[PDB]
Amino acid sequence: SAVKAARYGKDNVRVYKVHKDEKTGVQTVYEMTVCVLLEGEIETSYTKADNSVIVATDSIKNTIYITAKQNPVTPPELFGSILGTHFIEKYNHIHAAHVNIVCHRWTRMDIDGKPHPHSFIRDSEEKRNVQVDVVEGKGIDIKSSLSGLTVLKSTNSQFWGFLRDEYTTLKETWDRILSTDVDATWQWKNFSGLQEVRSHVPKFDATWATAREVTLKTFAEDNSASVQATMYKMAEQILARQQLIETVEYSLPNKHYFEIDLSWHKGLQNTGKNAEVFAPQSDPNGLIKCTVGRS
Amino acid sequence: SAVKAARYGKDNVRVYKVHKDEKTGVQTVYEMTVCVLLEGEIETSYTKADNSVIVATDSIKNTIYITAKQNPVTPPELFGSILGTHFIEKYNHIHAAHVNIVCHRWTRMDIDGKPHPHSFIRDSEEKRNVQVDVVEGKGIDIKSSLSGLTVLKSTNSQFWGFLRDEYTTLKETWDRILSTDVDATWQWKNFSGLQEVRSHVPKFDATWATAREVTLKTFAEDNSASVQATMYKMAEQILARQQLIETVEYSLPNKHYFEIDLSWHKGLQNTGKNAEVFAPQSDPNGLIKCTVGRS
Amino acid sequence: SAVKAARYGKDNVRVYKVHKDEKTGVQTVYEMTVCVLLEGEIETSYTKADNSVIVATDSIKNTIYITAKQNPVTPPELFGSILGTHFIEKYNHIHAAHVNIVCHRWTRMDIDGKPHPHSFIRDSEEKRNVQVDVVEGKGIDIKSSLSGLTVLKSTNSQFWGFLRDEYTTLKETWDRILSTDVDATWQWKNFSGLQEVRSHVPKFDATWATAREVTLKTFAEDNSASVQATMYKMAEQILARQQLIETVEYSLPNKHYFEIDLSWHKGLQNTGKNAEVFAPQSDPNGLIKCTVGRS
Amino acid sequence: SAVKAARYGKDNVRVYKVHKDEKTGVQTVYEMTVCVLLEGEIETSYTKADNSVIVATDSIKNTIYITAKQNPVTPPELFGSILGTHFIEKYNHIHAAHVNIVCHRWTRMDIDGKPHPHSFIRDSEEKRNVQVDVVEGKGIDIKSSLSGLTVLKSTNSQFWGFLRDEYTTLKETWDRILSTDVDATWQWKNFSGLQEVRSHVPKFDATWATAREVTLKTFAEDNSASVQATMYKMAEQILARQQLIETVEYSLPNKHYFEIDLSWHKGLQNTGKNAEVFAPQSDPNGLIKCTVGRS
Ligand SMILES: O=c1[nH]c(=O)c2nn[nH]c2[nH]1
Ligand SMILES: O=c1[nH]c(=O)c2nn[nH]c2[nH]1
Ligand SMILES: O=c1[nH]c(=O)c2nn[nH]c2[nH]1
Ligand SMILES: O=c1[nH]c(=O)c2nn[nH]c2[nH]1
Ligand code: NA
Ligand code: NA
Ligand code: NA
Ligand code: NA
Secondary structure, eight states: OEEEEEEEEEEEEEEEEEEEOTTTOOEEEEEEEEEEEEEESOHHHHHSOOGGGOBOHHHHHHHHHHHHHHSOOOSHHHHHHHHHHHHHHHOTTEEEEEEEEEEEOOEEEEETTEEEEEEEEOOOSOEEEEEEEEETTTEEEEEEEEEEEEEEESSSBOBOSOBOSTTOOOOOBSSOOEEEEEEEEEEEOOBSSHHHHHHTHHHHHHHHHHHHHHHHHHHHHOOBSOHHHHHHHHHHHHHHHOTTEEEEEEEEEEOOEEEOOOTTTTTOOOSGGGOOEEEEOOSOEEEEEEEEEOO | OEEEEEEEEEEEEEEEEEEEOTTTOOEEEEEEEEEEEEEESOHHHHHSOOGGGOBOHHHHHHHHHHHHHHSOOOSHHHHHHHHHHHHHHHOTTEEEEEEEEEEEOOEEEEETTEEEEEEEEOOOSOEEEEEEEEETTTEEEEEEEEEEEEEEESSSBOBOSOBOSTTOOOOOBSSOOEEEEEEEEEEEOOBSSHHHHHHTHHHHHHHHHHHHHHHHHHHHHOOBSOHHHHHHHHHHHHHHHOTTEEEEEEEEEEOOEEEOOOTTTTTOOOSGGGOOEEEEOOSOEEEEEEEEEOO | OEEEEEEEEEEEEEEEEEEEOTTTOOEEEEEEEEEEEEEESOHHHHHSOOGGGOBOHHHHHHHHHHHHHHSOOOSHHHHHHHHHHHHHHHOTTEEEEEEEEEEEOOEEEEETTEEEEEEEEOOOSOEEEEEEEEETTTEEEEEEEEEEEEEEESSSBOBOSOBOSTTOOOOOBSSOOEEEEEEEEEEEOOBSSHHHHHHTHHHHHHHHHHHHHHHHHHHHHOOBSOHHHHHHHHHHHHHHHOTTEEEEEEEEEEOOEEEOOOTTTTTOOOSGGGOOEEEEOOSOEEEEEEEEEOO | OEEEEEEEEEEEEEEEEEEEOTTTOOEEEEEEEEEEEEEESOHHHHHSOOGGGOBOHHHHHHHHHHHHHHSOOOSHHHHHHHHHHHHHHHOTTEEEEEEEEEEEOOEEEEETTEEEEEEEEOOOSOEEEEEEEEETTTEEEEEEEEEEEEEEESSSBOBOSOBOSTTOOOOOBSSOOEEEEEEEEEEEOOBSSHHHHHHTHHHHHHHHHHHHHHHHHHHHHOOBSOHHHHHHHHHHHHHHHOTTEEEEEEEEEEOOEEEOOOTTTTTOOOSGGGOOEEEEOOSOEEEEEEEEEOO
16 A cells, blocks of 8 residues: 555644734734645655654644744735745645635724724624645645625525426526525636735735625626526626636525415415515525636 | 423424515515424323323414514514414413524625615624513513624733632733623513503614613723623613613623743744734633623 | 622533553543533622632633542532532632533443453433532532433324314324434432532432433333323333432424425325335424423 | 536435335334535536526435435445436436435434334434545446544553654653544445446445444554554555555544643642643644555
């Protein structure tokens, strides 16, 4: 037998950082969960019990904290690139670092219509994420995403004209509820190294904001023919607005809300045009994916 | 042996309702999870296998949907009171109904600075809840709450002057992070029945809003001497603003963020006044409770 | 306003302890999650910012570890009583301690039909729990429980003869699936203090084992007329086998498995006597409770 | 823009099946969660709102139930292959089916030392899984796995001789706790189609059993030099015992249990050779992966 692939590191490293403006008194907080996995010439730790090649996962944890102390943690695309580059440059025998960052929301509170200098609220479990792969001699590959964005529209969704055969019971509809949890990922063109990532720093927050705005507006305004058709519209617009993105991937559950026939009870009308009360279904759920790239 | 207490019913009943304004085209959605448990002369179902006394839990589920079809579902204090009253009036041998409702957020989307007529976002997992106990001959007892309100302040929290003995290692501090998940419950004076609950309908949403506002403002503005002292201030203000509330209960975890000493690494300074990077602790957590009533 | 009730302490304290037999080489592990909440003359910490009355929650955490170092941690009824007694005896102004312990399974591995001296498996998320309330001048109240015991029987469950009215759609049945997650609690007679708890030490593990065995056997062997009837049989037997128990409480969800009518597809028969494939329902679920005591 | 990749289907489809032996009265239950995602000539559903190419996800759900009615559901490798093959053969324009199955434990109860004919217990959240990819003209690729197998050993784990530099604080150790949740996957050689999968049916359950046994025995008996070294031993043995496996992949968290220094309290000794009470850490955790193949 032989080692075909190996990677190891530290997962679930929670990190908080505060920035204090001494001039204005305003404080800003960042909180993330970080995972770093390394690859390189480490096979002998598996095959020969040779620990001399192992950068201890405990040390990886220390390094994350030290790196956060000495560098900006925002945008996360930059922080992840700094962190990954550190490992491949510091250790001769480590040739790839894989950094995953989940950013948690701490949104500044408004108290009496004024932004508070040091108080924050977690407004939703929506996350902003990055996956950064730093590979020696091959540059930096960055995938940015948003996830956990949960939305619902109560009308202006349709689904008709699908294949019907002996396995089909679903009725065609011209008016249904559409609800989903959005997972959207945009993949950047490969960067040659840290200098190039630094040169594009302003684009990272701006593209996240654009991706979010396009997702929300398109969902709200599209008279949707299907999840497939609406998601493609979203992806098309993101690609049009940021030339440095190569592909956009969406993964959308279709979270079903079923009509409840109440006609058995005193002829109560609660279906079709008379539908008011519905039963949200926890499972199963449709799952629709697509990756859109350039012609 | 004898049955000392018994209750049974249906839990985890998910319900969605939409309201459509035909005049304006505006739609409003409500989504809840409902539990209804009944008590009464039902001992023989346990002791003698006498099912004749059992209103099937499946029927309880049907009743929830039918009641939602025929009545407003907001405020939840009213809906819960209607639902509970139904069971004690309809069934001679049922003498108490216990209704728990969890309301999920569906907040109308703003698209281009305009409220959208039929599109919604789940902005946070914060819930508004009610517990309604309807007891034949004893009226209606309502406890309203908010839960899952997660906040953090990065300064203006202190904790010093606590008991020190041979079990104590905690250092006194004049500047720390304070973060919690707020669970706040206000208990209404007993109501004589549905007519009285109806007479107070406007107070329910207004008191929820007040409870939320007082919680947020007090948390943000108090130079906190302890979780205990800050929570008492919150409760005092709610009681002062709504005379129909008898007690206010808060249950607050203290979600700890620890300093990280980095001095072992090149004398890096990251403690006390130099603290920038902290480690959020998943567990353990302080848990502080209090119930405040009138003199 | 006035403080009507207050309690505070530390939750989610994870503790592991190992016992090493030097003679045999055999090691035994225990892992628990502990919560301790205190009450007493602590109102001024809430109302006057007087921290002098506060035993810091951090110190409570230290005390749990120290107590586990110096005492047996099994049975949990004994450990909880030792821990609670400590606080009321050590601190003049603390008058009640409330200790909750969740015990996690680490079951010794069998390797080649022989018990291994130091290797363990988590066989299920079933827990054994205790709630111990130690109140100065009022003794020690102990509630022991098992929870998270998930079972299913595929036949020998019935449900017919229930109330039918205009809210009823459920069909009577003489053969259904019954599945539940068992939560069973037995409440001990009040103990005068630690000496009395110590005198009954052997009864704690034996009664847990009896409660588990009675639950499993009764579930498997009863031709069940309802969840209500089967659960009462369980409780009756536990009370008969341990005179020091005052009450037994069961709380059982009814986790529904629905028939799937496939007749629309080529006349496929999958209902009643021909039912083979079913759809487990995640929600809603029946919830049935009862507390059984002595005549 | 262009569609680069697309797949869609139904996730979280819960399925239960019962087998009844009329001769012996013995019943056996199977419960799974199934996901099926399809690929093929479906781009126009995204780009042109052409639903004519869509097999509705609702129909996919129906098909899962019908297939379970008409075929054995065990071993899951066979069921998944039948299910995936159905879609590529039935629909001209569907060219790949991706089937994921999670099998839940329902272990027959022993009552009074005798196996019960129709009563079952969920003994642990350990799962047996399959991923089956059926691709038209390219055969059937099957990855089998076990996951959620949680184990701990209290001694006979070491970790010393790792890289030490200015980022290192971890002390070398010759005696520590080792605990993990095992995720192990074995990848079968490509199969030409359903006939070939059928020909190897007995190997599926036998190889799962071998993988489990090798994992448990090796964990218990290895005087572990590191997670890396122990996991490689496991993988090597599985490959040696089943020639039809091409690769074995393990992914293991290192779930840390920390010593607690209690020396500050009355010189209490709880470190090194005197360590009895430890603090399980919820996060962070080491994460170690490896894929082992043939020379
Ligand atoms: O078994 C281990 N492997 C590792 O790579 C490691 N790093 N810290 N502790 C460790 N333990
Ligand atoms: O065992 C049951 N008890 C009940 O109260 C009930 N209601 N519906 N189905 C039921 N099954
Ligand atoms: O606000 C606090 N209250 C407490 O009771 C406590 N105990 N430790 N830290 C604490 N912080
Ligand atoms: O938008 C949808 N897309 C689909 O593929 C589908 N299948 N059933 N319902 C559906 N809705
Ligand atoms: Na390198
Ligand atoms: Na009544
Ligand atoms: Na006392
Ligand atoms: Na095909």
